[PDB]
Design a protein around this ligand. Structure first.
Ligand SMILES: *[C@@H]1O[C@H](CO)[C@@H](O)[C@H](O)[C@H]1NC(C)=O
Ligand SMILES: *[C@@H]1O[C@H](CO)[C@@H](O)[C@H](O)[C@H]1NC(C)=O
Ligand SMILES: *[C@@H]1O[C@H](CO)[C@@H](O)[C@H](O)[C@H]1NC(C)=O
Ligand SMILES: *[C@@H]1O[C@H](CO)[C@@H](O)[C@H](O)[C@H]1NC(C)=O
Ligand SMILES: *[C@@H]1O[C@H](CO)[C@@H](O)[C@H](O)[C@H]1NC(C)=O
Lengths: 363, 277, 43, 130, 50
């Protein structure tokens, strides 16, 4: 990305305030800096000596260039065999971020097929014609018969000696048709929730994926190590090894532009991103409830009282204050669906007024 | 006393059984790494209740009402033009369209000038739209059941004094428990009102919550979650999942200086790191 | 049974539209109404 | 879809007779009030079953107090069984199934695809034990 | 509004809330931990007991 650009800038946030609390509690000084790469560190084969080594924050820690790693430490069995840990501050699991947010005219006339309107129109035309012929053969007359034939359908009387059965059957017909239309429109808008999620790690469709299930993880992360030790992930590993991304924002912009379709990530971070971007819904099955702590060296005098200060932060409401900083800090409409309804209403009103102009100009 | 009295006085080796972790326990012994997310929570009676049908703002949102008044004005103006082409329906055409919003008004004699029947048919078709939309609005209201929380969390205003509110209530914990020390290190008055509201047994407190002999109860989170998961009738859906709470974990307490720390910690990380947990 | 759990899937289990048959039967009742109206009309 | 037949005979088979019973009772009350104290002799059946739906059918203004009481009771009754009819449409919608096209190895389709208008098709993989 | 809410409410009563009230999952630990009324039985001296 950049050949040589390393500058002092401003840093703040969650773990920065955690370090401020550690400096407020204990009696020391410090210096804040960043890591060079954007990787956690993996036990990866280097080209010489046939020996796997480390890089990233673990590489700068084992070199002695780092004194205390304050990071979302994915506490695992691999890193504990080499360094010592602290007691965790964050309880946070893993989940799957996908894109199931599919918005919507609600199928009134124009998206739907036009059998119903033409059918009711031809039917009421046949009804009005046979009622006017029964008015001729009675056991503005045509206009009165047509207006009554509309008014029975209108839901808001000529000579019907042998025609009242026809009118009552037509009225029951009109109400049972509009009742069926109301019932199945409400039925379609209630059950409009198909299966669009993954349902956790136990998805056999992702155990043997295809070209649409585009899922990956962070390039050279501890999640890839946790999946690489387990044997039932290897095929998924063969899917994920060719699309691993550097940062989480790369995954955000990828699945937002649908370059991805699923992403394994920490839970509360995706909750905060769902609070930021309202088009992000994670899956339901929470898996691998993990813990974030502080990356530490071996046996050192900054192991006991530091973890005691962490537990002192756990016992009081300072964790709740940190939740108040970032975790708690969150963010028939008839304007899109019934807007075309109003447009067709206004167009029908204008056309009806024009037909009234033609009718007044004729008579 | 107890397991702490056995491990600190070295008559035992380690505390394999379930044990909360706080400050003075970490002072007296050296714990292992935590492995299970066991905070604290509150179990109450939490009966059925209602679905809270407050109001509705879905169709209009205080802006389609302008469209209703504009359509009333248009209908009134065209009715004035029709009756000028053809002496009591100047402002009463507004009432004519306005009582026929809900299609049960007094039937005014409609003119045969072909315009009013067309606009009444258009308004009746719009009525077919919006009564179906209201049935859709209530149909989108009964999707999943709900019950409002009387207590938001540990920072509740009801936790100040139940005499301030018109229903008084009661809250309990376990006697001689670590939750009592967590309260006494945080709130003295909570312990003072808990002292008169004591109890003895976990199943006894469960019966007291079911039979109405106790309103609220404070215990560890995951134990109450498992008790709700095996609940007779499953009428106990607790407030959240332990978000405004202590949010701690369980581990294994070892003696200060035991060489079994690193091996058992690596074994716990192995047991979590393979799905066997 | 463990191998059946491992090598099989069970998420797949066992669509709203206007029925054509319902108003077809309503049209049969309507044609019966036309027939009764014609019988009462001829006499 | 599920493709139902209708919504009258599988739903209202024992209710429809008693609805006609109450219709004839209310019409007999209307004729008895019209003869006790202008067209409430034979047209009252059409009037009463139009009060079931109320699809903008102007009929008359009943001067009988008993007629207006029966109109109020019949209107409230019509609203509540219209509500029950919509509830029963929802209840019929609640279940979801699929009607099978071929329900047998001895199907009438399997004799000859000329029996039906679309010519269907089915095959096997060769050299199979099936 | 009242009678439309009443209509939609009577449509909402028959909508099957509480779809299943028992322990039909075989791996549900109420099978592992029975109660005073969770009465499951088998045939005396059958292959199911073995
Ligand atoms: C705490 O930090 C300051 C930093 O200058 C140091 O001078 C002081 O001695 C420390 N306090 C103790 C008692 O160690
Ligand atoms: C290959 O081997 C050399 C040996 O010193 C090593 O330093 C280097 O990192 C490797 N190649 C690269 C990445 O330049
Ligand atoms: C840790 O804290 C104790 C007091 O609780 C103090 O006596 C001890 O010197 C501290 N050790 C270090 C070096 O942090
Ligand atoms: C709790 O402690 C008190 C101390 O006097 C005493 O009643 C007893 O030891 C304990 N009782 C219970 C209920 O555990
Ligand atoms: C069946 O097997 C024979 C022998 O291999 C082969 O000749 C024949 O083509 C096969 N049938 C078909 C059509 O695949």
């Amino acid at each position: 990305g950049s050949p040589r650009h390393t500058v002092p800038q401003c840093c703040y946030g969650f773990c920065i305030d955690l370090l401020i609390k550690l400096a407020r509690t204990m009696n020391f000084t410090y210096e804040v800096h960043l890591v060079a790469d954007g990787k956690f560190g993996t036990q990866e084969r280097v080209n010489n000596s046939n020996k796997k080594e480390w890089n990233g924050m673990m590489g700068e820690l084992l070199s002695g260039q780092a004194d205390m790693i304050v990071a979302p430490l994915t506490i695992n069995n691999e890193r504990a065999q080499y360094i010592e840990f602290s007691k965790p501050f964050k309880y946070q699991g893993l989940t799957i971020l996908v894109k199931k947010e599919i918005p919507r005219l609600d199928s009134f006339m124009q998206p739907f097929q036009s059998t119903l309107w033409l059918l009711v129109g031809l039917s009421v035309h046949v009804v009005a014609v046979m009622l006017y012929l029964l008015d001729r053969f009675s056991p503005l007359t045509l206009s009165s018969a047509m207006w009554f034939s509309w008014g029975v359908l209108l839901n808001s009387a000529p000579r019907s000696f042998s025609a009242r059965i026809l009118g009552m059957v037509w009225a029951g017909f009109a109400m049972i048709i509009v009742a069926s239309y109301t019932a199945n429109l409400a039925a379609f808008l209630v059950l409009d929730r198909p299966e669009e999620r993954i349902t956790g790690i136990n998805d056999p469709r992702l155990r043997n994926p295809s070209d649409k299930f585009i899922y990956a993880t962070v390039k050279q992360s501890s999640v890839d190590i946790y999946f690489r030790r387990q044997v039932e992930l290897s095929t998924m590993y063969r899917h994920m090894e060719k699309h691993n991304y550097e940062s989480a924002a790369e995954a955000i912009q990828a699945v937002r532009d649908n370059k991805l379709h699923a992403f394994i990530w920490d839970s509360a971070v995706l909750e905060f991103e769902a609070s930021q971007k309202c088009d992000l819904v994670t899956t339901g099955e929470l898996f691998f409830r993990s813990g974030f702590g502080i990356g530490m060296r071996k046996d050192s005098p900054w192991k006991q009282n530091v973890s005691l200060s962490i537990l002192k932060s756990h016992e009081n409401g300072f964790m709740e204050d940190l939740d108040k900083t970032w975790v708690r800090y969150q963010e028939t409409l008839t304007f899109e669906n019934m807007a075309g309804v109003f447009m067709l209403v206004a167009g029908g009103i204008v056309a009806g007024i024009f037909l009234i102009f033609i009718e007044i100009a004729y008579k | 006393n107890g397991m702490i009295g056995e491990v600190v006085y070295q008559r035992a080796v380690m505390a394999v059984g379930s044990l909360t972790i706080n400050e003075e326990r970490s002072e007296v012994v050296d714990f292992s790494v935590p492995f299970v997310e066991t905070g604290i929570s509150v179990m109450v009676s939490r009966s059925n209740g209602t679905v809270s049908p407050s109001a509705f703002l879905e169709p209009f949102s205080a802006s389609v009402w302008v469209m209703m008044f504009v359509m009333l004005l248009i209908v009134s103006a065209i009715a004035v033009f029709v009756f000028e082409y053809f002496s009591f329906t100047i402002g009463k055409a507004i009432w004519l369209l306005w009582g026929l919003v809900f299609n049960n008004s007094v039937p005014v004699q409609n003119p045969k000038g072909t315009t009013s029947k067309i606009m009444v048919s258009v308004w009746a078709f719009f009525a077919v739209i919006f009564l179906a939309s209201y049935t859709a609005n209530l149909a989108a209201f009964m999707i999943q059941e709900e019950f409002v929380d009387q207590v938001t969390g540990l920072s509740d205003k009801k936790f100040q004094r139940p005499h301030d509110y018109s229903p008084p209530f009661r809250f309990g914990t376990v006697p001689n428990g670590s939750t009592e020390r967590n309260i006494r290190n945080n709130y003295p008055y909570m312990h003072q009102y808990m002292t008169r509201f004591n109890q003895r047994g976990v199943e006894d407190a469960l019966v007291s919550l079911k039979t109405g002999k106790l309103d609220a109860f404070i215990y560890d989170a995951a134990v109450l979650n498992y008790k709700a998961g095996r609940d007779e009738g499953c009428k106990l859906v607790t407030i959240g999942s332990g978000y405004i709470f202590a949010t701690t974990g369980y581990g294994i307490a070892l003696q200060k200086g035991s060489p079994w720390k690193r091996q058992i910690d690596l074994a716990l990380l192995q047991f979590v790191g393979d799905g066997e947990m | 049974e463990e191998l059946e759990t491992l090598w099989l899937t069970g998420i797949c289990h066992n669509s709203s539209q206007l029925d054509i048959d319902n108003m077809a039967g309503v049209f049969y009742m309507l044609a019966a109404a036309m027939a009764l109206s014609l019988i009462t009309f001829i006499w």
